[PDB]
Amino acid sequence: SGFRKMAFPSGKVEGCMVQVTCGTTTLNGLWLDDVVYCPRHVICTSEDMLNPNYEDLLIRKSNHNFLVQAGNVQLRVIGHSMQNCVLKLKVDTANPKTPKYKFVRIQPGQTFSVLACYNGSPSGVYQCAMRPNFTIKGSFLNGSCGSVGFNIDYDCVSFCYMHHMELPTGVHAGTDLEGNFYGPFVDRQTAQAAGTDTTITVNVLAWLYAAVINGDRWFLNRFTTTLNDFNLVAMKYNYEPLTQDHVDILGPLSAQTGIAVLDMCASLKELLQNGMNGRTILGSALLEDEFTPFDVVRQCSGVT
Ligand SMILES: CN1CCCc2ccc(S(N)(=O)=O)cc21
Numbered sequence: 439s440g441f442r443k444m445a446f447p448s449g450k451v452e453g454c455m456v457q458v459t460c461g462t463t464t465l466n467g468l469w470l471d472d473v474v475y476c477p478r479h480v481i482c483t484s485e486d487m488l489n490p491n492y493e494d495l496l497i498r499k500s501n502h503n504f505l506v507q508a509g510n511v512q513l514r515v516i517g518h519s520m521q522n523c524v525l526k527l528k529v530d531t532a533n534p535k536t537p538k539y540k541f542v543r544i545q546p547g548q549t550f551s552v553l554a555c556y557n558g559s560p561s562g563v564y565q566c567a568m569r570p571n572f573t574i575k576g577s578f579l580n581g582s583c584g585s586v587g588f589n590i591d592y593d594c595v596s597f598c599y600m601h602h603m604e605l606p607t608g609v610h611a612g613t614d615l616e617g618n619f620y621g622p623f624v625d626r627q628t629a630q631a632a633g634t635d636t637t638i639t640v641n642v643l644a645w646l647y648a649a650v651i652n653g654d655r656w657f658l659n660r661f662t663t664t665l666n667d668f669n670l671v672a673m674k675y676n677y678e679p680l681t682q683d684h685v686d687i688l689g690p691l692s693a694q695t696g697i698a699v700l701d702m703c704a705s706l707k708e709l710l711q712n713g714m715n716g717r718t719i720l721g722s723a724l725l726e727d728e729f730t731p732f733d734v735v736r737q738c739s740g741v742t
Contacts, residue, residue: 451588
Protein backbone atom coordinates (compact mmCIF):
# COMPACT_ATOMS: atom_id res chain seq x y z
CA SER A 439 0.00 0.00 0.00
CA GLY A 440 0.98 3.72 -0.46
CA PHE A 441 1.62 5.75 -3.66
CA ARG A 442 4.78 7.81 -4.36
CA LYS A 443 6.35 9.51 -7.37
CA MET A 444 9.07 6.88 -7.74
CA ALA A 445 12.21 7.12 -9.92
CA PHE A 446 14.12 4.16 -11.42
CA PRO A 447 17.26 3.07 -9.55
CA SER A 448 20.16 5.17 -10.94
CA GLY A 449 23.02 2.70 -10.23
CA LYS A 450 23.50 1.74 -13.95
CA VAL A 451 23.54 5.40 -15.15
CA GLU A 452 25.89 6.67 -12.34
CA GLY A 453 28.89 4.77 -13.87
CA CYS A 454 28.49 6.50 -17.32
CA MET A 455 28.52 10.17 -16.17
CA VAL A 456 31.82 12.06 -16.87
CA GLN A 457 32.86 15.78 -16.71
CA VAL A 458 33.60 17.40 -20.10
CA THR A 459 35.65 20.59 -20.26
CA CYS A 460 36.35 22.63 -23.43
CA GLY A 461 37.78 26.14 -23.04
CA THR A 462 36.46 27.10 -19.56
CA THR A 463 32.88 25.66 -20.02
CA THR A 464 32.43 22.43 -17.98
CA LEU A 465 29.33 20.22 -18.26
CA ASN A 466 28.22 16.53 -18.00
CA GLY A 467 28.81 13.79 -20.61
CA LEU A 468 27.56 10.24 -21.14
CA TRP A 469 30.36 7.66 -21.60
CA LEU A 470 29.04 4.51 -23.41
CA ASP A 471 31.58 2.03 -24.88
CA ASP A 472 34.36 4.31 -26.35
CA VAL A 473 32.15 7.44 -27.05
CA VAL A 474 31.36 10.48 -24.86
CA TYR A 475 28.06 12.25 -25.70
CA CYS A 476 27.42 15.85 -24.51
CA PRO A 477 25.66 19.04 -25.62
CA ARG A 478 27.62 20.64 -28.49
CA HIS A 479 27.21 24.11 -26.83
CA VAL A 480 30.16 23.06 -24.57
CA ILE A 481 32.32 24.58 -27.37
CA CYS A 482 30.65 28.06 -27.12
CA THR A 483 32.18 30.97 -25.11
CA SER A 484 29.47 33.33 -23.66
CA GLU A 485 29.37 35.78 -26.68
CA ASP A 486 29.09 32.70 -28.98
CA MET A 487 25.78 31.58 -27.36
CA LEU A 488 23.71 34.52 -28.77
CA ASN A 489 24.45 33.46 -32.36
CA PRO A 490 26.62 30.35 -32.61
CA ASN A 491 27.90 29.00 -35.95
CA TYR A 492 28.61 25.44 -34.64
CA GLU A 493 30.37 24.28 -37.94
CA ASP A 494 32.84 27.18 -37.81
CA LEU A 495 33.23 26.88 -33.99
CA LEU A 496 34.00 23.10 -34.05
CA ILE A 497 36.54 23.48 -36.92
CA ARG A 498 38.63 25.71 -34.55
CA LYS A 499 38.72 22.87 -31.90
CA SER A 500 41.38 20.14 -31.56
CA ASN A 501 40.99 16.79 -29.71
CA HIS A 502 43.39 18.05 -26.96
CA ASN A 503 41.11 21.10 -26.25
CA PHE A 504 38.55 18.54 -24.89
CA LEU A 505 39.18 17.43 -21.24
CA VAL A 506 37.10 14.35 -20.38
CA GLN A 507 37.57 13.17 -16.75
CA ALA A 508 35.79 10.13 -15.06
CA GLY A 509 36.58 10.47 -11.32
CA ASN A 510 40.41 10.96 -11.33
CA VAL A 511 40.77 8.96 -14.58
CA GLN A 512 41.41 11.45 -17.49
CA LEU A 513 40.23 9.91 -20.84
CA ARG A 514 42.10 10.79 -24.01
CA VAL A 515 40.08 12.20 -26.96
CA ILE A 516 41.15 10.74 -30.38
CA GLY A 517 37.97 11.68 -32.36
CA HIS A 518 35.16 14.29 -32.41
CA SER A 519 32.06 14.79 -34.58
CA MET A 520 28.74 16.54 -34.21
CA GLN A 521 25.41 14.75 -34.63
CA ASN A 522 22.80 17.49 -34.78
CA CYS A 523 22.95 19.14 -31.33
CA VAL A 524 25.23 16.48 -29.63
CA LEU A 525 29.02 16.20 -29.75
CA LYS A 526 30.38 12.62 -29.99
CA LEU A 527 33.96 12.40 -28.57
CA LYS A 528 35.66 9.00 -29.50
CA VAL A 529 37.99 8.18 -26.48
CA ASP A 530 40.81 5.56 -26.14
CA THR A 531 38.99 3.67 -23.28
CA ALA A 532 35.60 1.82 -23.52
CA ASN A 533 33.60 2.30 -20.27
CA PRO A 534 34.10 -0.95 -18.25
CA LYS A 535 30.67 -0.06 -16.67
CA THR A 536 28.70 0.41 -20.00
CA PRO A 537 25.29 -1.27 -19.29
CA LYS A 538 22.91 -2.76 -21.90
CA TYR A 539 21.41 0.39 -23.43
CA LYS A 540 19.57 1.89 -26.32
CA PHE A 541 18.61 5.38 -27.48
CA VAL A 542 14.82 5.95 -27.80
CA ARG A 543 12.94 9.12 -28.72
CA ILE A 544 9.92 9.19 -26.30
CA GLN A 545 6.45 10.68 -27.03
CA PRO A 546 4.79 13.47 -25.02
CA GLY A 547 3.03 12.23 -21.85
CA GLN A 548 5.70 9.53 -21.30
CA THR A 549 7.60 9.58 -17.94
CA PHE A 550 11.35 9.08 -17.29
CA SER A 551 13.85 9.38 -14.44
CA VAL A 552 16.46 12.23 -14.48
CA LEU A 553 19.86 11.86 -12.86
CA ALA A 554 20.76 15.53 -12.19
CA CYS A 555 24.61 15.99 -12.26
CA TYR A 556 27.33 18.72 -11.75
CA ASN A 557 30.95 18.21 -12.96
CA GLY A 558 30.18 14.61 -14.00
CA SER A 559 29.04 13.77 -10.35
CA PRO A 560 25.43 12.61 -9.66
CA SER A 561 23.53 14.90 -7.20
CA GLY A 562 20.02 13.43 -7.19
CA VAL A 563 17.30 11.55 -9.06
CA TYR A 564 13.66 12.52 -9.86
CA GLN A 565 10.81 11.27 -12.09
CA CYS A 566 9.00 13.59 -14.49
CA ALA A 567 6.96 13.76 -17.69
CA MET A 568 7.70 15.04 -21.21
CA ARG A 569 4.99 17.78 -21.38
CA PRO A 570 2.72 17.79 -24.49
CA ASN A 571 4.61 20.99 -25.53
CA PHE A 572 7.97 19.03 -25.41
CA THR A 573 9.31 20.79 -22.25
CA ILE A 574 10.04 19.33 -18.78
CA LYS A 575 9.45 21.00 -15.40
CA GLY A 576 12.86 20.00 -14.05
CA SER A 577 15.37 20.96 -11.33
CA PHE A 578 18.58 21.99 -13.17
CA LEU A 579 21.27 24.51 -11.92
CA ASN A 580 24.10 26.02 -13.99
CA GLY A 581 26.36 23.12 -15.12
CA SER A 582 23.47 20.56 -14.95
CA CYS A 583 23.72 20.51 -18.84
CA GLY A 584 24.30 16.95 -20.21
CA SER A 585 22.22 15.44 -17.31
CA VAL A 586 20.23 12.53 -18.88
CA GLY A 587 16.77 11.03 -18.58
CA PHE A 588 16.24 7.27 -18.83
CA ASN A 589 13.93 4.25 -18.27
CA ILE A 590 14.93 0.72 -17.23
CA ASP A 591 13.38 -2.28 -19.08
CA TYR A 592 14.60 -5.23 -16.87
CA ASP A 593 18.39 -5.03 -17.47
CA CYS A 594 18.26 -2.52 -20.42
CA VAL A 595 18.77 1.26 -19.89
CA SER A 596 16.72 3.27 -22.47
CA PHE A 597 18.30 6.75 -22.77
CA CYS A 598 15.63 9.23 -24.00
CA TYR A 599 16.69 12.73 -22.80
CA MET A 600 19.77 14.95 -22.62
CA HIS A 601 19.35 18.39 -20.94
CA HIS A 602 20.60 21.39 -23.04
CA MET A 603 18.99 24.54 -21.62
CA GLU A 604 16.53 26.48 -19.48
CA LEU A 605 14.05 28.77 -21.22
CA PRO A 606 13.64 32.31 -19.90
CA THR A 607 10.17 30.96 -18.72
CA GLY A 608 12.02 28.61 -16.23
CA VAL A 609 11.23 25.30 -17.98
CA HIS A 610 13.77 22.89 -19.46
CA ALA A 611 14.45 21.83 -23.09
CA GLY A 612 16.78 19.15 -24.49
CA THR A 613 17.43 16.45 -27.08
CA ASP A 614 17.33 12.75 -27.64
CA LEU A 615 20.77 10.99 -27.59
CA GLU A 616 20.90 11.40 -31.45
CA GLY A 617 20.90 15.23 -30.86
CA ASN A 618 17.37 16.21 -32.02
CA PHE A 619 15.47 18.64 -29.81
CA TYR A 620 12.18 17.64 -28.37
CA GLY A 621 10.03 20.55 -29.54
CA PRO A 622 10.77 23.64 -31.65
CA PHE A 623 13.94 24.67 -29.73
CA VAL A 624 17.45 25.51 -30.96
CA ASP A 625 20.66 25.61 -28.86
CA ARG A 626 21.11 29.37 -29.09
CA GLN A 627 20.43 31.98 -26.40
CA THR A 628 17.40 33.74 -27.91
CA ALA A 629 13.85 34.27 -26.63
CA GLN A 630 12.01 30.97 -27.50
CA ALA A 631 8.30 30.25 -26.95
CA ALA A 632 7.03 26.80 -25.78
CA GLY A 633 3.50 25.90 -26.95
CA THR A 634 0.39 25.95 -24.81
CA ASP A 635 0.84 23.11 -22.23
CA THR A 636 -2.08 20.61 -21.93
CA THR A 637 -2.90 18.16 -19.07
CA ILE A 638 -2.17 14.50 -19.99
CA THR A 639 -5.72 13.05 -19.59
CA VAL A 640 -4.64 9.39 -19.94
CA ASN A 641 -2.13 9.83 -17.03
CA VAL A 642 -4.74 11.51 -14.78
CA LEU A 643 -7.11 8.54 -15.37
CA ALA A 644 -4.26 6.09 -14.53
CA TRP A 645 -3.80 8.07 -11.27
CA LEU A 646 -7.51 7.90 -10.34
CA TYR A 647 -7.29 4.09 -10.85
CA ALA A 648 -4.22 4.22 -8.51
CA ALA A 649 -6.33 6.15 -5.93
CA VAL A 650 -9.19 3.60 -6.01
CA ILE A 651 -6.71 0.72 -5.59
CA ASN A 652 -5.31 2.64 -2.53
CA GLY A 653 -8.63 3.26 -0.70
CA ASP A 654 -9.51 6.83 -1.99
CA ARG A 655 -12.96 6.21 -3.71
CA TRP A 656 -15.09 9.38 -2.84
CA PHE A 657 -15.04 10.74 -6.49
CA LEU A 658 -16.75 7.67 -8.14
CA ASN A 659 -20.34 8.31 -9.38
CA ARG A 660 -23.06 6.26 -11.23
CA PHE A 661 -23.01 8.89 -14.14
CA THR A 662 -21.34 8.00 -17.44
CA THR A 663 -20.54 9.47 -20.90
CA THR A 664 -19.02 8.56 -24.31
CA LEU A 665 -15.57 9.72 -25.54
CA ASN A 666 -17.23 12.28 -27.82
CA ASP A 667 -19.16 13.92 -24.98
CA PHE A 668 -16.28 13.66 -22.40
CA ASN A 669 -13.63 15.02 -24.84
CA LEU A 670 -15.73 18.17 -25.49
CA VAL A 671 -15.60 18.92 -21.69
CA ALA A 672 -11.80 18.10 -21.73
CA MET A 673 -10.89 20.77 -24.44
CA LYS A 674 -12.51 23.57 -22.37
CA TYR A 675 -10.14 22.76 -19.39
CA ASN A 676 -7.06 22.26 -21.65
CA TYR A 677 -6.92 18.43 -21.28
CA GLU A 678 -5.59 16.28 -24.21
CA PRO A 679 -8.46 14.58 -26.06
CA LEU A 680 -8.83 10.87 -25.27
CA THR A 681 -8.52 8.32 -28.18
CA GLN A 682 -9.45 4.57 -28.41
CA ASP A 683 -5.75 3.58 -27.89
CA HIS A 684 -5.99 5.45 -24.55
CA VAL A 685 -9.07 3.35 -23.52
CA ASP A 686 -7.10 0.25 -24.74
CA ILE A 687 -4.07 1.13 -22.53
CA LEU A 688 -6.31 1.51 -19.39
CA GLY A 689 -8.10 -1.91 -19.89
CA PRO A 690 -5.89 -3.68 -17.26
CA LEU A 691 -6.57 -1.06 -14.54
CA SER A 692 -10.29 -1.27 -15.60
CA ALA A 693 -10.13 -5.11 -15.03
CA GLN A 694 -8.33 -4.94 -11.63
CA THR A 695 -10.84 -2.31 -10.32
CA GLY A 696 -14.12 -3.43 -12.04
CA ILE A 697 -14.55 0.22 -13.16
CA ALA A 698 -15.13 0.73 -16.90
CA VAL A 699 -12.87 3.44 -18.43
CA LEU A 700 -15.95 5.56 -19.51
CA ASP A 701 -17.33 5.42 -15.93
CA MET A 702 -13.95 6.78 -14.70
CA CYS A 703 -14.08 9.51 -17.43
CA ALA A 704 -17.56 10.55 -16.12
CA SER A 705 -15.96 10.97 -12.57
CA LEU A 706 -13.18 13.14 -14.07
CA LYS A 707 -15.65 15.20 -16.19
CA GLU A 708 -17.34 16.04 -12.82
CA LEU A 709 -14.07 16.88 -10.98
CA LEU A 710 -13.13 19.42 -13.77
CA GLN A 711 -16.58 21.06 -13.67
CA ASN A 712 -16.87 21.11 -9.80
CA GLY A 713 -13.19 20.75 -8.62
CA MET A 714 -12.05 19.07 -5.33
CA ASN A 715 -13.46 21.44 -2.57
CA GLY A 716 -10.62 20.90 -0.07
CA ARG A 717 -10.77 17.10 -0.71
CA THR A 718 -7.43 15.52 -1.75
CA ILE A 719 -6.66 12.28 -3.68
CA LEU A 720 -3.51 10.31 -2.65
CA GLY A 721 -2.88 13.40 -0.46
CA SER A 722 -2.77 15.90 -3.41
CA ALA A 723 -5.17 18.90 -3.87
CA LEU A 724 -4.62 18.94 -7.69
CA LEU A 725 -5.02 16.38 -10.47
CA GLU A 726 -1.74 14.66 -11.28
CA ASP A 727 -0.63 13.77 -14.85
CA GLU A 728 3.00 12.49 -14.31
CA PHE A 729 2.14 8.75 -13.97
CA THR A 730 1.52 6.60 -17.04
CA PRO A 731 -0.83 3.60 -16.84
CA PHE A 732 2.42 1.50 -17.04
CA ASP A 733 3.86 3.45 -13.99
CA VAL A 734 0.65 2.75 -11.94
CA VAL A 735 0.65 -1.03 -12.90
CA ARG A 736 4.44 -1.39 -12.11
CA GLN A 737 4.08 0.43 -8.76
CA CYS A 738 0.80 -1.44 -7.83
CA SER A 739 2.05 -5.04 -8.88
CA GLY A 740 5.74 -4.83 -7.72
CA VAL A 741 7.88 -4.96 -10.94
CA THR A 742 11.77 -4.87 -10.53
C1 LIG B 1 23.36 29.54 -22.31
N1 LIG B 1 22.49 28.64 -23.09
C2 LIG B 1 23.07 27.40 -23.61
C3 LIG B 1 22.60 27.16 -25.03
C4 LIG B 1 21.09 27.19 -25.20
C5 LIG B 1 20.44 28.30 -24.41
C6 LIG B 1 19.12 28.69 -24.68
C7 LIG B 1 18.50 29.69 -23.94
C8 LIG B 1 19.23 30.33 -22.91
S1 LIG B 1 18.52 31.60 -21.93
N2 LIG B 1 17.10 31.98 -22.57
O1 LIG B 1 18.26 31.05 -20.62
O2 LIG B 1 19.39 32.73 -22.05
C9 LIG B 1 20.55 29.99 -22.64
C10 LIG B 1 21.17 28.97 -23.37
